[PDB]
Amino acid sequence: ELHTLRYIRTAMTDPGPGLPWYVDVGYVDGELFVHYNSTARRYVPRTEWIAAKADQQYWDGQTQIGQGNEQIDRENLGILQRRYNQTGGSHTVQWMYGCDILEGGPIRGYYQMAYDGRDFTAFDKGTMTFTAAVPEAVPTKRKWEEGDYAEGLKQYLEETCVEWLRRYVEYGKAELGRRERPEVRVWGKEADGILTLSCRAHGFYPRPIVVSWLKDGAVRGQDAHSGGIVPNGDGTYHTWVTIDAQPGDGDKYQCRVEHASLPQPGLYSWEPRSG
Amino acid sequence: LTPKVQVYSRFPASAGTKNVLNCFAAGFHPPKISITLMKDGVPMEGAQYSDMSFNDDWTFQRLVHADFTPSSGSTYACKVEHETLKEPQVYKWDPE
Amino acid sequence: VIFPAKSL
């Protein structure tokens, strides 16, 4: 059904010690597959499906553009610094571009850029023009709308980006379509007259999950605290959900976990030890 | 723009079992951050640093993971250094 | 496939 492609890119002045200044990270359905860095200077695989099913020509081809982009984005640091009237310091440039496809056909085509954590330029596919947010984005706006860069980006987001994403999904249909059980553990702590109940899901795939605390059948999201969905090293996901309650009402509270891997929502009551 | 740090384990923590200690920081700028996994105040051996990425709101995120075995009595914490924090923040981890 | 960058 829905398949998303995203290319996260970062250009840094202060990496700082023993770290690469230029990093290009790729994503397929919210999962890391490709990576590029200023020290290695080569595009390397991160998943099994992209390493085997993709040709050697693809790796040498992506590296050619990758090395070229690194040299272009190197001068881009200085271009902004001279425009903003900056001598130096900690400054970073961010890039976010990709496509979202639904049942084959594309539904989204974005190209966004930011400087020092603030929106700089954003491409509009409909009007074929680059939107300026900061008054320092007008020279970039006049530069790209002048040549064939606007036409080339529109051709990429509608053809090149769409055609290749269909292949990436076909290559990793088993690794993206898989489902893993989270393994839920419940623990409670006694503080200054307040009982803090914790619900933890360790390793689940895909990323979306619904972990909420229930009191006497009714869902309580008013007092419940959540740290969102955090990723793991292997490729799976983790989540942290807590709730503050009065001591003695441990039987009334139940943690419900809703996931694609489970056919029915898993209930987890807090049974203590007291030993 | 202060980093939101969450320290957790890959599998449910048990005594004398092979587990991975994860330290994730989200919502920080500048991207320069010093995250180190500690065991009783001393840094852990064999620490792997996951590739740096950022969310839709241009806020950076990074993960630090290492293979370990939890022992009773030994305290596990995460030391995070950032330009906005002004002082190094220590995040304690609970096994149970 | 990555898109080629241009000077600002």
Identify the residue whose tokens are 């492609």: A5
Which of these, A134, A94, C6, lies nearest to B53 by C-alpha position? A94
* A160 three-class SS: helix
Total of domains in chain B: 1
Please measure the distance between the N-terminal and C-terminal CA atoms of chain C and give it in whole angstroms. Answer: 22
- Contact (CB, 8 A) for A255 and A217: no
* Cα B63 to Cα B23: distance, rounded to the nearest angstrom: 6
Chains in touch with B (3+ beta-carbon pairs under 8 Å) read A
Experimental method used, please? Answer: X-ray
- Contact (CB, 8 A) for A142 and A129: no
Identify the residue whose tokens are 């509608």: A158
Domain that holds residue B26: 1-96
A27 lies within 8 A of chain C by CB: no
CB contact under 8 A, A72 and C3: no
> For residue C1, which residues of chain A lie inside 8 Å, CB to CB?
62, 160-161, 164
Which of these, A80, A122, A232, lies nearest to C8 by C-alpha position? A80
AA identity, residue A253? Y
In Å, how far are A99, A113, A150, A162, C5 from A129, measured between CA atoms?
Answer: 18, 14, 7, 21, 16
- Contact (CB, 8 A) for A66 and A44: no
Identify the residue whose tokens are 């330029």: A121
For A97, the closest chain B residue by CA position comes to B56
In Å, how far are A104, A118, A132, A274, B62 from A139, measured between CA atoms?
Answer: 37, 17, 10, 69, 33
Which of these, A236, A75, A126, A159, lies nearest to B9 by C-alpha position? A236
| Strand locations in chain A (E) | 2-12, 22-28, 31-37, 44-45, 92-102, 105-115, 118-124, 129-132, 184-190, 195-204, 210-215, 218-219, 225-231, 237-245, 253-258, 266-269
Chains in touch with A (3+ beta-carbon pairs under 8 Å) read B, C
Domains of chain A (ranges; CATH) run 1-178 (3.30.500.10), 179-268 (2.60.40.10)
- Contact (CB, 8 A) for A223 and A244: yes
Residue A24 backbone phi and psi in degrees, to 5: -120, 110
CB contact under 8 A, A117 and B24: no
- Contact (CB, 8 A) for A148 and A123: no
- CATH classification of the domain holding B8: 2.60.40.10
Which of these, B8, B28, B9, B21, lies nearest to B85 by C-alpha position? B28
Cα dihedral sign, A12-A62-A207-A184: negative
- Contact (CB, 8 A) for B3 and B80: yes
The DSSP-derived string for A43-96 is: -EE-SHHHHHHS-HHHHHHHHHHHHHHHHHHHHHHHHHHHHTT---SS-EEEEE
